From a paper:
FtsZ in the P212121 and P21 crystals of the KpFtsZtr–Mb and EcFtsZtr–Mb complexes all showed the R conformation, and the crystals contained one and three complex molecules per asymmetric unit, respectively. The superposition of the Cα atoms between the P212121 and P21 KpFtsZtr protofilaments composed of three KpFtsZtr molecules indicates that the protofilament of P21 KpFtsZtr is curved. The crystal packing revealed a tight packing of trimers but fewer interactions around the GDP of the top molecules. The binding region of Mb was distant from the GTP-binding site of FtsZ, which is consistent with the finding that the GTPase activity of KpFtsZ was not mostly affected by Mb binding.
FtsZ is a tubulin homolog GTPase protein that is widely conserved in bacteria and plays a key role in a complex called divisome, which carries out cell division. FtsZ polymerizes into protofilaments to form the Z-ring that acts as a scaffold for accessory proteins during cell division. FtsZ treadmilling, a motion in which the protofilament polymerizes in one end (plus-end) and depolymerizes in the other end (minus-end), drives cell wall synthesis that constricts the Z-ring to form a septum of the cell. In order to aid high-resolution structure determination of the FtsZ protofilament, we developed a monobody (Mb) that binds to both KpFtsZ and EcFtsZ with high affinity.
Author numbering:
A (entry chain B): 0 to 90
B (entry chain A): 10 to 316
Write the structure that this text describes.
Amino acid sequence: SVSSVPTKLEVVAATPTSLLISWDAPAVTVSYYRITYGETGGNSPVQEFTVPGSKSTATISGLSPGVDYTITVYARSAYHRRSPISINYRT
Amino acid sequence: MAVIKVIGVGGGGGNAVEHMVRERIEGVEFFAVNTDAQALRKTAVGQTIQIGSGITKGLGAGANPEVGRNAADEDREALRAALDGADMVFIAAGMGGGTGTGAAPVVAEVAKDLGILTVAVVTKPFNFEGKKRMAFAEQGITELSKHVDSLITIPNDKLLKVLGRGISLLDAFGAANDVLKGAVQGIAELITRPGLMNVDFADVRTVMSEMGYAMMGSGVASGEDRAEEAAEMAISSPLLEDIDLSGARGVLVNITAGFDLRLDEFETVGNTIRAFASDNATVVIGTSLDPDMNDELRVTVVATGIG
Ligand SMILES: Nc1nc2c(ncn2[C@@H]2O[C@H](COP(=O)(O)OP(=O)(O)O)[C@@H](O)[C@H]2O)c(=O)[nH]1
């Protein structure tokens, strides 16, 4: 039904300056995740970091309160080249 | 100017190609080839080809490799004109079925007679699929071998090592779409998205023509050891497990990075490969370019002439 990996993605804890995102467990072993976030519609280069493939949460710190953000999680697996999932958040 | 075509043969072959069409492979042409006329409209491939206007009544050759082979042998002209002008063809089929096990060696024979570089990428069925289905797919692979330059076999039982618990049937099955796609996308992209150490088509024909049985493995990695680690994941891959890497007549390597690839990362991948392969083998190492990639690496290895 949903083509990407991860297939679900939400913010599960939300201060005004830091977010705990969470995604579903993958059917197929992920090596690591690429995690990117920027202001929705921005010219600054997006920030990105990696979390081990065993993880299903990520903390994005140092955010600007009441600022609109677009988060993207890529699953990097040696078994596929699947596409990312994405969400938008304020505060 | 090179023409690459991918043929999804059968019901599960067209499944994988439908997923390659949705996920996009750049600079290739996708065809779907099957007896089942119903599911041959319920797919947005763009090029549909039913084998057997007559020998089948638009129905499906269920678990049927006899008339599946005959269904194919009945429009060897329909195949030929969709092939014409190809430098390279990928035949993607689910082995152990009916329509896919009998037509794929026929499909491959036509492309071989047109002088098209014929690579077949096919999947050995699972466990829960049973022993009549798996022993089917042995007779296809040995009939396919007599009509291909290179035959990449991926056994689906290898996937259950990276498939978690409680994954459904559909999960186990899109997962086999992806290994087919990766086997096509990691070869074709040396041609379609070449990087700064390029593998042209002639280098590809050389590693892969009249070579027979082939196996492949991939790795990804980021950070400071992405090259050593992606290479280790590829040489160690389970999809490659059964093969003495040293015993292949050829090795084709595709390093997929995006600009920030260091001179000594290419070093690392190369020497790792050169250590696990024969000094006499046709060893072809190059890169493909994905500019959307940063601080991460992908390595793809196909060992050819393993038979
Ligand atoms: N990747 C993938 N493999 C499939 C699919 N359907 C079937 N297979 C595999 O192919 C074998 C036979 O299915 P199928 O290809 O539909 O039979 P056929 O089309 O009549 O040759 C099974 O053992 C499956 O493991 C699919 O949609 N995708």
